[PDB]
């Protein structure tokens with residue numbers, strides 16, 4: 086269930102047929118914390134080529150936003166930390182089009198910041214790329230990612246390039262991107278009538294459930310380390326056999342220590358794949374969803 | 382247009398589902414299934430694209446869709462008439478390995494690791510392995526359910542990789558030993574229990590081969606017995 | 619396989635008259651009840667998308683006894699077929715879960731699947747009973763239409779300003795979200811291992827563990843993730859339950875005013 090006598094020997098590690106140079110971040114066993122629940126270690130790490138930027142970049146983004154973040158506050162703590170949610174960087178909307186050549190305070194920051202985070206994601210993308218390599222895994226997370234990137238790449242890039250208007254991108258602030266949402270509803274014609282959206286919900290629930298199903302299984306399956314999934318997709322003992330019997334019987338029909346994660350990598354990815362489709366339609370190839378709908 | 386979108390998307394879907402997806406579920410599970418309903422109770426797929434695996438460091442090879450049955454003594458009888466019908470174990474089930482009990486038969490080769498670290502050793506055998514946070518079952522007199530105790534803790538065989546307190550050795554009063562899986566047992570301050578398994582036996586606990594190493598059939602053979610307790614132990618219920 | 623697992627007993631109640639497997643299905647005196655409670659449901663029900671005249675899988679619908687009609691009463695046309703039909707889930711479901719124990723108990727396995735969904739059958743009730751029951755009325759319970767529900771949803775929602783403001787709401791999303799990839803990673807991990815590059819030998823348990831400390835520089839091997847996963851999930855649903863139960867009842871105002879509790883004082 087969740088560790089009741091904790092152990093933790095030395096400090097462990099592995100090849101990478103690759104640039105191990107990286108190693109800073111030192112084995113600092115965590116016990117009460119990330120121990121009781123998960124894993125006691127803490128690092129090592131591997132701050133490769135790419136990983137640098139990810140960070141370099143990943144911050145500016147944070148810095149830039151963080152910056153014009155202050156100005157609204159007027160360089161004031163009590164201020165700054167009040168309207169903190171409330172503060173926000175809104176694009177060159179100043180609605181005036183996929184026409185860069187912007188002012189800092191209108192376009193600017195945003196065109197700057199936003200557009201800079203282009204990079205993190207992008208790179209760090211690579212990251213999951215080779216961290217696989219070294220180890221010579223497959224390349225699934227590279228796969229199980231461009232989802233995360235679709236609805237990204239879209240939501241703030243593709244689309245607004247489609248209406249010839251960043252005027253169309255989502256804005257940076259806590260309580261702002263929330264708001265920039267439904268606003269987004271009202272204009273696409275109450276948008277639940279959106280086919281793709283519902284799937285996207287179709288699924289974003291599909292998980293909740295299933296992580297709540299796969300997870301909760303393996304647990305009734307410790308009794309026999311159902312958890313050891315590889316030294317199982319090679320060799321079946323009760324573990325598998327029965328964590329599938331349950332379902333074979335209950336809902337009649339079952340899966341396979343692999344397929345199940347075959348059920349998994351997907352179950353989730355659609356959850357994003359989907360919405361991305363949803364969203365390059367919902368301002369073009371569909372001015373309204375009621376309508377479109379009512380016309381079906 | 383988007384009707385061509387959402388209308389063919391409905392291909393990527395039906396597409397995968399009973400395709401890849403459920404296809405893979407099959408890969409190496411009752412690569413088709415008999416005993417009454419012959420060739421099925423409807424219209425699956427005649428077993429997918431058979432594929433082969435790569436057994437880890439040390440080599441081996443497994444081709445997944447395979448018909449490795451079992452004439453490995455199912456003491457499982459008959460209850461009558463139709464299939465779906467239960468099938469009673471021919472006497473004390475816990476042993477013959479059937480019902481809750483039932484084991485399997487993974488290799489007589491324990492799951493190695495990274496290298497040859499046969500992954501699951503005992504605490505002594507170990508390098509620098511002790512108890513960060515916890516009580517220590519060691520010397521912890523293991524109870525039963527009975528309430529007549531059935532042994533004294535002798536180790537916690539450690540999992541190297543996960544660094545997982547995998548099992549806890551327990552020496553009966555035949556100056557003997559046997560290890561009981563961790564996700565059984567309740568380490569309470571002064572006392573212990575793999576309650577599942579009334580003391581008033583315990584013995585059932587199959588032995589391992591060498592007293593340093595739990596091989597697959599070991600772990601697996603071990604692991605059932607214990608549980609069957611759940612199913613098949615009078616007190617409890 | 620199975621054949622050995624098809625082994626008398628585990629019966630919560632039924633004793634015997636129930637130890638059997640309609641083929642792939644283990645009957646037992648809950649599937650048997652699961653039944654009696656699904657039939658009688660869609661019967662009374664199906665009786666409704668009639669009475670409605672129209673129907674259309676799509677727009678056959680069921681609403682409860684609309685507000686001030688009361689908590690008490692209602693009649694198999696303004697109330698009832700909803701009423702009753704409801705008492706058919708908060709029971710057909712509960713009934714199955716149990717069918718869930720029964721399979722477990724015998725199946726050898728462990729406790730928790732049946733607990734996890736016990737949350738689901740717990741989200742629901744909230745919305746169609748708790749919420750309702752507290753607002754001394756069953757009107758915040760909801761439709762039963764493949765399509766209204768957005769509506770029933772879409773309004774109450776907006777009943778309280780941009781609902782994406784109710785805090786707890788804030789949250790549950792972010793579990794909802796996280797417990798997502800949270801699968802996007804797990805579902806992708808186990809995989810790459812199990813199914814590697816072109817010729818490389820099947821990977822290692824600590825083959826994985828090794829990736830993550832490299833991407834992320836922590837990493838919660840095998841077990842730790844199936845718990846964690848069943849975590850963010852189970853949670854977030856529930857943190858949903860809070861959202862509401864709380865929304866119609868100690869926040870009468872548009873959500874955006876909450877937020878000031880902060881933006882007050884010094």
Ligand code: BCL
Nearest residue numbers: 233237266267269270277282285286289360361363364795
């Ligand atoms: C009230 C407002 C509108 C509405 C407006 C929208 C809008 C607008 C959009 C969605 C979309 C979604 N909505 Mg909707 N939605 C409403 C009603 C609902 C309800 C409900 C009624 O029950 C439900 C359940 C849903 C459910 C959903 C999800 C299925 C879906 C995306 C969520 C997700 O899982 O991926 C979320 C995935 C991501 C956010 C991936 C992001 C990846 C990036 C690259 C990672 C960035 C990391 C960064 C660099 C670091 C920052 C770290 C943080 C500080 C921690 N909506 C109402 C009708 N919804 C999306 C959609 O599918 O549109 C087609 C979307 O765009």
Ligand code: BCL
Nearest residue numbers: 738739741742771772774775781782790791858859861862
């Ligand atoms: C426009 C309206 C508002 C808003 C208004 C509301 C309202 C109003 C409510 C929510 C709730 C929800 N919203 Mg909100 N929401 C908005 C926008 C969002 C966005 C977004 C991206 O913008 C997101 C991601 C969300 C997220 C969500 C989820 C946290 C949550 C759903 C609860 C839940 O799933 O319980 C899931 C519960 C179940 C699935 C119930 C049990 C189902 C049954 C029992 C399962 C068995 C059924 C049957 C047997 C299956 C058999 C199948 C067949 C035999 C095959 N909302 C907009 C801005 N939201 C709901 C919530 O908090 O509920 C607690 C809610 O009431």
Ligand SMILES: CC[C@H]1c2cc3[nH]c4c(c3C)C(=O)[C@H](C(=O)OC)c4c3nc(cc4[nH]c(cc(n2)[C@@H]1C)c(C(C)=O)c4C)[C@@H](C)[C@@H]3CCC(=O)OC/C=C(\C)CCC[C@H](C)CCC[C@H](C)CCCC(C)C
Nearest residue numbers: 139140143144147205206209229230232233795798799802
């Ligand atoms: C499959 C769909 C889901 C998905 C998938 C997905 N995400 C992924 C993967 C996949 C499959 C990874 O492999 C990749 C990964 O490497 O991280 C786990 C990742 C990831 N998903 C991320 C975020 C993310 N994904 C999201 C959504 C989704 N990702 C979907 C739910 C969300 C939302 C919107 O819920 C978020 C916030 C990152 C954790 C990671 C890749 C992020 C990346 O591009 O790198 C960003 C670089 C930086 C942030 C630079 C760092 C400095 C910054 C200023 C950050 C401040 C952090 C703060 C200081 C910490 C404070 C906490 C402390 C108190 C501890």
Ligand SMILES: CC[C@H]1c2cc3[nH]c4c(c3C)C(=O)[C@H](C(=O)OC)c4c3nc(cc4[nH]c(cc(n2)[C@@H]1C)c(C(C)=O)c4C)[C@@H](C)[C@@H]3CCC(=O)OC/C=C(\C)CCC[C@H](C)CCC[C@H](C)CCCC(C)C
Nearest residue numbers: 290293294656659706707710711714734735737738762855
């Ligand atoms: C709460 C934690 C997450 C979760 C987990 C969960 N669900 C589970 C499990 C687990 C752990 C199961 O083991 C169990 C199952 O065996 O699933 C495969 C189940 C399950 N989760 C279900 C559904 C569902 N889960 C939901 C959510 C979640 N499930 C959570 C996110 C949702 C939503 C929308 O989030 C949906 C749609 C079922 C597939 C299944 C068990 C359902 C069951 O008991 O069905 C029996 C069928 C009948 C009795 C016929 C119905 C008779 C009714 C009287 C009439 C119908 C009225 C009802 C309102 C239908 C809906 C009306 C309108 C709203 C449409």
Ligand SMILES: CCCCCCCCO[C@H]1O[C@H](CO)[C@@H](O)[C@H](O)[C@H]1O
Nearest residue numbers: 147150151240241255257258259262
């Ligand atoms: C496509 C645009 C996606 C933006 C969605 C939210 C992106 C920013 O989200 C958050 O990150 C900032 C970091 O500077 C925080 O300071 C703010 O809370 C907010 O900007």
Ligand SMILES: [Fe+3]
Nearest residue numbers: 299314804808
């Ligand atoms: Fe898993």
